[PDB]
Design a protein around this ligand. Structure first.
Ligand SMILES: [Mg+2]
Ligand SMILES: [Mg+2]
Ligand SMILES: [Mg+2]
Ligand SMILES: [Mg+2]
Ligand SMILES: [Mg+2]
Ligand SMILES: [Mg+2]
Ligand SMILES: [Mg+2]
Ligand SMILES: [Mg+2]
Ligand SMILES: [Mg+2]
Ligand SMILES: [Mg+2]
Ligand SMILES: [Zn+2]
Lengths: 170, 63, 107, 189, 52
RNA sequence: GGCCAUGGAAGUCGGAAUCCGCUAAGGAGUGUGUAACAACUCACCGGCCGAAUGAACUAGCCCUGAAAAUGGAUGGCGCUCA
């Protein structure tokens, strides 16, 4: 269960450099302790800065703009497998940016055995145009007048024994 | 080594062969087929001296 | 890249022969050999040019270019199936004497 | 990928009345009725009209989608079996030993009796499936005509006859003897 | 002796085949993989050899 | 029926070659067939339908790779949208 955070940090000011540049990252983390931890993890992949020589300036939750609008998200990924490092791009249907990332973490765990530690989120983009959708497993839900049944419904029973024959209509 | 100015004669004695464009295409048919032998065709092998006038070397627009 | 160049040469020579001569009628064949076609153009050295190719290319490559040579337009719905072209200009009788000449049949 | 929905359209000719109830297809045509149970597949049926039927798979994976056009083809084969019939022609192929084939009836059952195959003293008997008609062609020498409404039974009887005539302990590239299916068509040309 | 028309009919079922190189399977000539599980559906195939 | 080999080899036994001409189409030929041709089949181009298609690679689970001796061990039962 994740949240999207805006984390802003900078190098500690010096008499040489008293206003270092402020860098922001959007972090998908379960809580604010991991959000500031993940921030320093990525700054040390790019900038000559450390947690000992730096400073966290702001941590803020980024809420969904239209949390009850159904969207299609494209997520660009860079994950590590048992053998190498790979770039990937996948698409998810959800109403929040965070909920697509939660589906993403479940999805790469299941099909590629990629743990949380092995995944970098390069970019999450809401696809405005139906022509922006490249993947067929989410494009099939953008067809006009979409209808489908749910055959073979299995009902969960509170009791061990039922006195009537089971059914699966729905 | 031939032509011996008679490679057109070989084309105009074999006048009934290549159903080409304008007579000179008949000469190229003997040019192509005689390359499969390999002799003193102007010093080397054909598919070369052929390809000179094929693009346009000296002058054989014989009527 | 070669095909688009050979396509360009095909439309180049398609319009080169269109203005040089004029007027053409129905010209369809079937079960016609390669040596069968060589016979017609053997006697038709210069009085006619056996323009050849296919269908789908010819229709659109001219239909889109109905600006420099419009006139045709509604003429395109005529091009169905195995149809060649014999680019020439003589008379309704003077061409069928030299073209219809060779016939190969079968039971 | 779990395709949301996949469809196929059956086409019912004018004189044919398909009839489907609980995945039990009963196809009726001028030539008769054929029935087939499909309870081993998860498909649903919709009658578009009297001449067309939609066959649908909902939320099916690759193999479960693959099982849809085969349902279509089986019902289409049923339709053409009750509107055109099926006919397999077999030619008798032998280099030296003529194959003596008779249509015998023993114990109230029809059998195809192959004798002298590759000179063997053994008599081969193939049971003729119900609904399958055998005939020795008069217009052709060494030809057997297997006909019937059901394509599956006709082709399987033909295969039985072909399989009982397999060559053992020889170079089968050289010893090409046997009974082979030469033509697979319909009763109505 | 078999007439050439009948010898082509026979050769379909006896000769026109491909063979798996690891487990010796009679495969269709156009087959790209062996249908047997024991060899792992290998693509290492070769045509059935002919009399000569 | 290209040259040379060859009893013969004409595309389809074998060697230098791998060209040309017409073509939108065609290889001095991908096969079956001949003592040899012929024959048909393909290479490529046509007509037809009409919206997708082919190739290489990466890594998840599964399978092949995977052979030992008393009967037997994910602890056992058993489990397959587990
Ligand atoms: Mg750097
Ligand atoms: Mg999910
Ligand atoms: Mg998933
Ligand atoms: Mg998914
Ligand atoms: Mg990492
Ligand atoms: Mg209950
Ligand atoms: Mg033996
Ligand atoms: Mg396997
Ligand atoms: Mg294993
Ligand atoms: Mg559970
Ligand atoms: Zn195998």
């Amino acid at each position: 269960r994740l949240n999207e955070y805006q984390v802003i940090g900078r190098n500690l000011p010096t008499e040489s450099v008293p206003e270092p540049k402020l860098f922001r990252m959007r972090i998908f983390a379960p809580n604010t302790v991991v959000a500031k931890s993940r921030y320093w993890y990525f700054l040390q992949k790019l900038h000559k800065v450390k947690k000992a020589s730096g400073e966290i300036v702001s941590v803020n939750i980024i809420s969904e703009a239209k949390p009850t609008k159904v969207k299609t998200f494209g997520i660009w990924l860079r994950y590590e497998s048992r053998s190498g490092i790979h770039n990937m791009y996948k698409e998810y249907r959800d109403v929040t940016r965070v909920g697509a990332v939660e589906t993403m973490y479940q999805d790469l765990a299941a099909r590629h055995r990629a743990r949380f530690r092995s995944i970098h989120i390069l970019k999450v983009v809401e696809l405005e145009k139906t022509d922006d959708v490249k993947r067929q497993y989410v494009k099939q839900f953008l067809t006009k007048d979409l209808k489908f049944p749910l055959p073979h419904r299995v009902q969960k029973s509170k009791k061990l024994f039922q006195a009537t024959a089971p059914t699966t209509f729905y | 080594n031939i032509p011996l100015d008679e490679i057109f004669e070989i084309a105009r004695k074999m006048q009934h062969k290549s159903f080409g464009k304008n007579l000179a295409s008949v000469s190229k048919e003997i040019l192509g087929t005689a390359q499969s032998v390999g002799c003193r065709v102007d010093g080397k092998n054909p598919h070369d001296i052929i390809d000179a006038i094929n693009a346009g070397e000296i002058d054989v627009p014989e009527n | 890249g070669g095909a688009r160049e050979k396509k360009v040469q095909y439309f180049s020579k398609l319009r080169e022969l269109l203005e040089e001569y004029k007027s053409i009628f129905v010209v369809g064949v079937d079960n016609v050999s390669s040596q069968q076609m060589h016979e017609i153009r053997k006697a038709l050295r210069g009085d006619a040019v056996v323009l050849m190719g296919k269908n789908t290319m010819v229709r659109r490559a001219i239909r889109g270019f109905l600006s420099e040579l419009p006139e045709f337009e509604k003429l395109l719905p005529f091009i169905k199936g195995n149809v060649g072209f014999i680019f020439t200009n003589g008379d309704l009788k003077s061409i069928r004497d030299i073209v219809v000449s060779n016939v190969v049949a079968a039971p | 990928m779990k395709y949301i929905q996949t469809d196929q359209i059956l086409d019912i000719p004018e004189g044919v009345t398909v009839d489907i109830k609980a995945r039990v297809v009963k196809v009726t045509g001028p030539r008769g009725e054929l029935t087939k149970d499909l309870k081993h597949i998860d498909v649903t049926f919709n009658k578009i009209n009297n001449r067309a039927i939609k066959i649908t798979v909902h939320n099916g994976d690759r193999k479960h989608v693959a099982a849809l056009r085969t349902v279509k083809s089986l019902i289409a084969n049923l339709i053409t079996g009750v509107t055109k019939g099926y006919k397999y022609k077999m030619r008798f192929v032998y280099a030296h030993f003529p194959i003596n084939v008779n249509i015998i009836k023993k114990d109230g059952q029809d059998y195809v009796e192959i004798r002298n195959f590759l000179g063997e003293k053994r008599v081969r008997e193939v049971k003729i499936h119900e609904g399958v008609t055998m005939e020795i062609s008069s217009t052709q020498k060494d030809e057997l005509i297997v006909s019937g409404n059901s394509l599956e039974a006709v082709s399987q009887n033909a295969a039985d006859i072909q399989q009982i005539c397999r060559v053992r302990n020889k170079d089968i590239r050289k010893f090409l003897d046997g009974i082979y299916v030469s033509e697979r068509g319909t009763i109505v040309e | 002796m078999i007439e050439p028309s009948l010898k082509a009919l026979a050769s379909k079922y006896n000769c026109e085949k491909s063979i798996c190189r690891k487990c010796y399977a009679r495969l269709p000539p156009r087959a790209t993989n062996c249908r047997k599980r024991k060899c792992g559906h290998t693509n290492q195939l070769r045509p059935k050899k002919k009399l000569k």
